[PDB]
Paper text:
The β-strands in the centre form a tunnel atop of which the active site is located in a groove, presumably to allow long chains of PNAG to bind. GH20 enzymes use a substrate-assisted catalytic mechanism, also referred to as neighbouring-group participation (NGP), in which the reaction proceeds via the formation and subsequent breakdown of a neutral oxazoline intermediate.
In the active site of both enzymes 6-Ac-Cas was distorted into a 1S3 conformation, which is consistent with the proposed catalytic pathway of GH20 enzymes based upon the 1S3/4E (Michaelis complex/product) conformation for GH20 enzymes that was first observed for the S. marcescens chitobiase. In marked contrast, the Kd of DispLp for 6-Ac-Cas was 1.12 mM. In the structure of DispTs2, Glu300 (Glu332 in DspB) forms important ligand interactions with the C4 and C6 hydroxyls of the pyrrole ring to stabilize the ligand conformational changes during catalysis. This substitution could explain the 184-fold reduction in the dissociation constant of DispLp for 6-Ac-Cas compared with DispTs2 and 6-Ac-Cas. Interestingly, there are two waters in the DispLp structure that superpose well with the OE1 and OE2 of glutamate (Glu332 in DspB and Glu300 in DispTs2), one of which is coordinated by Gln252 (corresponding to Leu or Val in the other two dispersins); these waters might compensate for the Glu/Ala substitution. Therefore, as well as implications for its catalytic efficiency attributed to a loss in hydrogen-bonding capacity, DispLp might be able to accept a β-1,4-linked substrate since there would not be any steric clashes from the 4-position, with the groove now 3 Å larger.
Residue numbers in the entry: -1 to 331
Write the structure that this text describes.
Amino acid sequence: PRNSSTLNTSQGVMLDLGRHPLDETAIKAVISAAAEQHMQYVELHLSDNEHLCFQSAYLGNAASATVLSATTLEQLVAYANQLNIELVPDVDLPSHAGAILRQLQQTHPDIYNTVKLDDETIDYTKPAAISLATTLYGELDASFNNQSQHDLMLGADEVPGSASAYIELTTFINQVSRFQNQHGFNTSIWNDSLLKNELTRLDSNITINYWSQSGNNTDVAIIADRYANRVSVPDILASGHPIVNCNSYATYYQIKNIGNVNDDDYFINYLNHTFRPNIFNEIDTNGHNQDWTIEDGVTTNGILVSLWGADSEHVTPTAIVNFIKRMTIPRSF
Ligand SMILES: CC(=O)N[C@H]1CN2CC[C@H](O)[C@@H]2[C@@H](O)[C@@H]1O
């Protein structure tokens, strides 16, 4: 399978629009900031449980300053292209899909009843769920097409299901990835819903964004289960998938907290001076979340910084942009 992605050797920033919507003016200022800081891409997390921030012809939602029309997205892609920045759509499925589901209930109540697993999740074991996913992604691919590099984050974080259900999650991801490849797009997913036993069945051109082996769990029984059953970085190296380091200690920050001088200073200084690209957040042999796991087998250096948006309505675009302008993501081990 073709894998033209270079995200595994790139530096980028992710904006959580699904929790903290932004308009075109603000997103252009983020793109500019990323370019000033020598980043290669900006990832737009366009939907989550809270908000649906892309217009879909199929879903029938109305556009606005923050529900980005195809024309607005095309303008942002053209702006990014002028600054030599890749714009990476990021539309979470099958979970973190509450806003898509609420809209689908209104315009396709039939399809909603078929595909709703829970309030946040489409039923990825059913053919109707893959059909929905490819319909939405095909629409977005066209809006994001007029640039050199084509990547979309499918996500697949925090997915509900049994171990048996997860077998069907692999199939869902692969079918969507193959559809995307037909449209010239590479696909990324998070690591946390990936079983060891499924990893070799996941297409090898799918990039895995590695945030936390435990999914930021502290319950010791959950940790034990994820240590035994969920992918490590060594597992991913053995399977041959590309990796992006999204270490949840070093690379995650809540928009809500921007402007807190000490916290901002620690995050920035740790990122800029202490963190290294081969340092992952994995479970150690003592059952601890070890955010400083050195992986000597990793030869690539990709890092994404994630700005998560819950409960951050009053944080301004200027504050977000100025925080990005402080970042110098490390490139050397
Ligand atoms: C990939 C991932 O981090 N998934 C979720 C869990 N993380 C952990 C830190 C945030 O809650 C963030 C949340 O906003 C995300 O939706």
